[PDB]
Design a protein around this ligand. Structure first.
Ligand SMILES: Nc1nc2c(c(=O)[nH]1)N[C@H]1C(S)=C(S)[C@@H](COP(=O)(O)OP(=O)(O)OC[C@H]3O[C@@H](n4cnc5c(=O)[nH]c(N)nc54)[C@H](O)[C@@H]3O)O[C@H]1N2
Ligand SMILES: Nc1nc2c(c(=O)[nH]1)N[C@H]1C(S)=C(S)[C@@H](COP(=O)(O)OP(=O)(O)OC[C@H]3O[C@@H](n4cnc5c(=O)[nH]c(N)nc54)[C@H](O)[C@@H]3O)O[C@H]1N2
Ligand code: SF4
Ligand code: SF4
Ligand code: SF4
Ligand code: SF4
Ligand code: SF4
Ligand code: SF4
Ligand code: SF4
Ligand code: SF4
Ligand code: SF4
Ligand code: SF4
Ligand code: SF4
Ligand code: SF4
Ligand code: SF4
Ligand code: SF4
Ligand SMILES: [K+]
Ligand SMILES: [S]
Ligand SMILES: [W+6]
Lengths: 126, 342, 80, 429, 94
């Protein structure tokens, strides 16, 4: 399903980054995708099911979660972090600032696993 | 034996026997003023906090009655100024029984004087007033004749576009050799026409005559007025707002309101709680101008005490110097009513 | 038995409730002005360890102002 | 258990200076007044890596070294680079930031902070059209219209509303009840839940919406009958609310710096605020993110003349956001070395930038384990500002508040590390 | 606006929605059901309905130096590639 990806802060992601990016707390709070209940029905997923997110700029796997902050129709929300930054638009339009918000992506269910923090960074072949 | 049934928010307390007694509490009418629990001679009633029952959602009712203590005397139903408690005796409410005290209050609209302006309906804080009104048909508020010369008319369609009320219609068509015309008719709906003369002034061929001008009935406004006695709280907003002094109100209690502006922290609870719209937060007219923190107009106050009860810092106090009732034949009742004076 | 009740696991520690409370405001000019108290004062609740923490519930008048100032239902008035 | 009062919180740009720290044995174990985020930074969470000592990677596994050796390796990298990038700065104090500028000159580096992924667009906007602001106390004591445009303070500046909206002020003694609260956000945020007016506009259409508001303000009819999903009548009503304010404040954040148009969204927001002042007193404040992102832009500006994306490659300072920004040098593959201090670009840059950080030497002045330290070749743990070290920080509207040292640490401070690093870079040339 | 009692009948009856009233719920601080009334004279077509319905005669309305006379302008184009020269235009023209 083609949706609009919005990204940004949550109080839980804020608590997680100041505790430690290495903790499971961070994966549970930033490796997620908030969706409206009705969008989860049309796609056949429930809370806890994992989602494959593909864009023109990359791909990532995140855990689906009902949004306590309701979204407009067609929009999803992934909190700021390395998982969200797999798929958002990098180009800055000659301002230095990447397009972190409102990016067309494809979302589909997946039995694949969510990568933890050290493992996700391996995709960049350091 | 005394029993109790709680249907939804409502409470019913019943004693059967030779004389049947039923106390009925409608939660939706309770302003949580607390008077019933104060007057109760057996401390059977406990009233919940006035703020919490108004500003938050609660599963419980506004009051609670102890069946084990309730003796079904009905002082609570006699005092309640919101008509939320009723004692019925052999099926008949005590409001119908002269031997039982009744607070004295009223609210009437003189229909002859009333001009159906609807100010009271708007201002009523309990939405207890209904004002209906019948305006004349538009066609009766304009007089004039208008005719279109359909021969002179060349069907340019400018009147039809410019009519502000779409009163002109043209029967357009594609020509044929058998009907070599771009339209077959033009009409003015004189029910819609308001005789502004725009058509006449735009017509390029002066095809339209339009002019503004025996016992014809004068057009006049009619209506009705209803005050729901179950909702009416007798604040007198209708009496004050009325431009023609057509509404008359009398109140049960007399008293005084006292506000400590420096103790008030402007949490707005009392403003939201007041069933009479007495209390408000004035806005400054000019930058740098200061206003009274908590403003009141006692013209609308009935001295029920809900606001004082709701204030967590006790910034408001409600003095009550008189309770007007029908004759209180029991001296014990009389002293219990007098216990509410302060 | 309606009274104040916290849900610290839902709370952001944002402080809206502490400031809005007229009891807290009356007792602390700092709170009244949107600040956390620095002066030692006895108020209904504060944010402690990042979450709202009821300290003196006997002072609560159950008016519901704090409840209406919280968007995440982390503080409520209910049966205890 | 010593109680430390009047502590300045080192997280977000609200820069609360009323924190109370619970100190049990040279350790912070709890707080008062701090929000859930602030509390998290003051307190160590069990299991989380706090780097005790410097590190250097050899075979994908790090090895502990001394400060001198790690600083020597780092200075070697910077001194032989031809386009080195020195990025971050926003979560450290201003003296460390000032050494950084002198180091950037010495190394011929590009020095840039987190503004270039945050309110840099606001910086570009204000350079073109201006910057009409006020301090928090003015909002508290005067404001009767408060607007959160494209920000979610409940989640990102948690005590901001309590400190500025629910707070009672001199001419606003009724607190929340004296203020009209407006939130503009495509989502029903927890901030929007508290608002009196929620403009739930279409995403990426703020610029269009503000064009209609500005044109309506100057007396012009709105061409379209719906703009950004907002009906024409509702736009005119919103503009009337702003015109009737006695004192209006426009707070704004990433919803318009990151979204379509970027700096031009802020541009047009600023010009509306300016022109509102012919009808009502109006100002704006950008919701600066980190507690001292504003401080780096202050320091850099007053030392070099420019606020961020500053290139010292030519000796003279030169400035071109879109070229000399951190994401520009990485995505165009210009940079051959990256020094990261007090920031986590590994977590918070896009993949195209991360692709370049994997190819170049990366130095990280970082106390914790982050995605950046995973991409790093040297790690240098510092003392944490506002907990273990002091120095100036700047609140989001420019108010300088000195961070405080609550506990002691055997670790070096940012300022110390950079001062030694600077000395070694001078040497290697 | 002083005589006006804000009954709202003009606003309902205006055939072109030229009258607007700023209605409100009263408060003890603002004990009025409206704060203003306005006539958009760009929309008003001067039919006098408002004046005749007003219950308190608060509305004065009357129908009435080089002002430009209002006149209709336009243009005319014949596409030569489409024009077939049937002369319908010549005959239909008034
Ligand atoms: N919890 C937490 N708090 C933090 C941080 C953190 O990482 N976590 N970091 C701090 C930093 S660095 C910063 S910069 C601040 C940022 O704080 P904010 O400026 O609040 O940043 P975001 O939450 O990313 O985005 C705010 C809102 O923009 C909205 N938005 C998205 N697209 C659009 C649009 O097209 N139009 C409009 N009007 N709105 C849109 C989103 O729905 C979102 O709710 O937070 C700081 N505080
Ligand atoms: N998808 C998406 N991506 C985004 C955003 C978004 O909205 N969406 N927002 C962007 C924005 S606005 C920003 S600013 C960035 C976030 O910008 P970052 O600077 O990456 O945010 P943090 O993760 O808080 O990074 C601060 C780091 O410094 C460390 N630190 C704390 N105190 C000190 C100190 O005293 N000294 C030193 N040396 N280090 C310290 C912390 O442990 C932490 O790892 O994210 C950006 N990326
Ligand atoms: S008296 Fe006041 S409280 Fe007791 S019922 Fe009638 S209203 Fe409810
Ligand atoms: S009936 Fe007489 S007793 Fe039962 S409650 Fe009402 S008052 Fe107290
Ligand atoms: S106010 Fe006086 S006139 Fe207008 S409706 Fe109510 S009563 Fe009739
Ligand atoms: S007079 Fe005014 S209204 Fe009556 S038709 Fe001609 S134009 Fe339309
Ligand atoms: S304007 Fe004069 S001519 Fe044109 S249609 Fe109306 S009437 Fe016929
Ligand atoms: S009195 Fe108060 S309540 Fe009873 S009607 Fe006139 S207004 Fe509505
Ligand atoms: S009086 Fe008490 S209740 Fe009414 S506002 Fe002031 S504080 Fe809130
Ligand atoms: S103000 Fe007058 S009416 Fe309103 S609550 Fe207090 S007393 Fe009852
Ligand atoms: S309770 Fe609701 S409001 Fe009081 S702090 Fe926790 S969140 Fe902020
Ligand atoms: S309820 Fe009213 S009083 Fe009790 S705390 Fe919340 S606010 Fe202060
Ligand atoms: S607001 Fe920002 S600053 Fe004030 S405490 Fe919460 S986190 Fe620290
Ligand atoms: S004159 Fe006719 S049109 Fe002009 S306002 Fe009165 S009613 Fe509406
Ligand atoms: S009709 Fe006469 S009174 Fe009623 S509103 Fe129009 S003007 Fe005011
Ligand atoms: S009408 Fe016949 S002639 Fe006049 S234009 Fe159309 S085609 Fe040419
Ligand atoms: K921590
Ligand atoms: S930032
Ligand atoms: W930021």
């Amino acid at each position: 399903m083609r949706v609009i990806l919005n990204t940004g802060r949550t109080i839980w992601q804020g608590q997680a980054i100041e505790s430690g990016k290495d903790l499971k707390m961070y994966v549970d709070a930033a490796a997620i995708i908030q969706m409206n209940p009705e969008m989860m029905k049309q796609l056949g997923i429930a809370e806890g099911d994992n989602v494959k997110v593909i864009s023109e700029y990359g791909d990532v796997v995140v855990k689906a979660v009902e949004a306590k902050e309701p979204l407009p129709e067609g929009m999803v929300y992934i909190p700021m972090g390395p998982w969200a930054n797999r798929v958002i638009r990098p180009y800055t339009d000659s301002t230095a600032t990447p397009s972190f918000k409102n990016i067309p992506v494809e979302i589909i269910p997946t039995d694949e696993e969510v990568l933890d923090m050290p493992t996700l960074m391996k995709v960049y072949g350091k | 034996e005394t029993t109790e049934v709680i249907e939804g928010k409502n409470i019913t307390v019943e004693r059967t026997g030779e004389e049947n007694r039923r106390l009925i509490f409608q939660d939706c009418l309770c302003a949580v003023c607390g008077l019933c629990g104060e007057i109760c001679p057996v401390s059977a009633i406990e009233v919940n906090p006035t703020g919490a029952m108004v500003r938050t959602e609660q599963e419980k009712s506004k009051i609670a009655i102890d069946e084990n203590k309730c003796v079904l005397c009905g002082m609570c139903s006699s005092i309640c100024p919101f008509q939320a408690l009723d004692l019925q005796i052999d099926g008949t409410s005590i409001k119908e029984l002269a031997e039982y005290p009744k607070i004295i209050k009223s609210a009437e609209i003189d229909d002859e004087t009333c001009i159906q302006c609807k100010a009271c309906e708007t201002a009523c804080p309990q939405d207890a007033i209904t004002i209906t009104r019948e305006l004349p048909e538009r066609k009766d508020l304009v007089t004039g004749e208008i005719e279109i010369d359909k021969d002179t008319c060349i069907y340019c369609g400018m009147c039809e576009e410019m009519c502000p009320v779409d009163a002109i219609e043209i029967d357009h068509q594609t020509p044929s050799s058998a009907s070599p015309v771009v339209a077959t008719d033009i009409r003015v709906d004189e029910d819609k026409c308001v005789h502004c003369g725009i058509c006449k002034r735009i017509c390029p061929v002066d095809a339209i005559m339009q002019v503004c001008r025996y016992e014809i009935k004068t057009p006049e406004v009619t209506g009705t007025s209803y005050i729901d006695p179950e909702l009416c709280v007798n604040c007198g907003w209708c009496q004050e707002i009325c431009p023609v002094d057509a509404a008359t109100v009398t109140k049960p209690f007399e008293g005084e309101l006292i506000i400590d502006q420096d103790t008030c922290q402007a949490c707005e609870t009392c403003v939201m709680v007041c069933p009479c719209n007495v209390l408000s937060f004035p806005k400054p007219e000019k930058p740098g101008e200061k206003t009274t923190k908590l403003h009141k107009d006692e013209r609308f106050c009935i001295y029920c005490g809900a606001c004082e009860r709701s204030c967590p810092v006790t910034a408001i106090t409600v003095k009550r110097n008189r309770i007007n009732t029908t004759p209180i034949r029991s001296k014990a009742w009389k002293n219990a009513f007098d216990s509410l004076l302060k | 038995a309606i009274g104040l009740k916290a849900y610290p696991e839902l709370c952001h520690g944002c402080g809206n409730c502490v400031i809005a409370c007229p009891v807290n405001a009356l007792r602390s000019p700092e709170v009244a002005g949107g600040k956390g108290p620095t002066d030692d004062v006895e108020i209904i609740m504060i944010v402690e360890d990042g979450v709202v923490n009821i300290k003196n519930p006997d002072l609560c008048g159950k008016c519901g102002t704090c409840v209406e100032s919280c968007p995440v239902d982390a503080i409520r008035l209910e049966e205890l | 258990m010593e109680y430390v009062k009047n502590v300045v919180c080192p997280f977000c740009g609200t820069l609360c200076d009323d924190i109370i720290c619970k100190v049990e044995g040279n350790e912070i174990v709890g707080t008062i007044n701090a929000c859930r985020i602030g509390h998290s930074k003051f307190v160590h969470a069990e299991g989380a890596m706090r780097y005790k000592k410097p590190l250097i990677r050899k075979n994908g596994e790090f090895v502990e070294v001394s400060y001198d050796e790690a600083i020597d390796k780092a200075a070697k990298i910077l001194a032989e680079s031809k386009r080195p990038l020195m990025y971050g700065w926003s979560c450290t104090e201003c003296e460390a930031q000032a050494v950084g500028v002198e180091l950037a000159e010495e190394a011929g580096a590009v020095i840039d902070n987190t503004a270039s992924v945050c309110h840099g667009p606001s910086v570009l906007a204000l350079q073109d059209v201006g910057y009409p602001i006020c301090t928090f106390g003015e909002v508290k004591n005067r404001a009767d219209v408060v607007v959160y445009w494209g920000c979610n303070p409940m989640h990102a500046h948690p005590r901001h509303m309590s400190r500025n909206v629910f707070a009672r002020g001199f001419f606003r003694e009724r607190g929340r009840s004296d203020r009209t609260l407006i939130v503009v956000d495509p989502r029903k945020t927890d901030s929007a839940k508290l608002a009196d007016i929620h403009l739930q506009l279409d995403f990426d259409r703020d610029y269009e919406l503000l064009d209609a508001m500005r044109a309506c303000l100057l007396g012009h009819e709105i061409l379209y009958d719906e703009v950004a999903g907002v009906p024409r009548e509702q736009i005119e009503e919103a503009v009337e609310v702003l015109k009737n304010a006695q004192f209006g404040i426009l707070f704004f954040g990433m919803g318009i710096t990151h979204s379509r148009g970027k700096h031009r969204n802020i541009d047009t927001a600023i010009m509306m605020v300016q022109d509102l002042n012919d009808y009502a007193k109006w100002t704006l404040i950008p919701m600066r993110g980190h507690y001292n992102v504003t401080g780096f832009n202050q320091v850099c500006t007053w030392e070099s003349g420019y606020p961020y994306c500053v290139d010292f490659s030519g000796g003279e300072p030169r400035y071109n956001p879109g070229e000399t920004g951190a994401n520009d040098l990485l995505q165009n593959r210009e940079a051959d070395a990256m020094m990261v201090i007090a920031s986590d670009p590994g977590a918070h840059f896009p993949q195209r930038a991360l692709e370049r950080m994997a190819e170049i030497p990366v130095i990280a002045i970082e106390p914790h384990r982050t995605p950046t330290t995973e991409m790093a070749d040297i790690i240098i743990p510092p003392a944490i500002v506002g907990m273990e070290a002091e120095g100036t920080a700047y609140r989001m509207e420019g108010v300088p508040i000195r961070m405080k040292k609550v506990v002691d640490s055997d670790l070096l401070s940012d300022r110390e590390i950079l001062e030694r690093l600077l000395e070694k870079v001078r040497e290697y040339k």
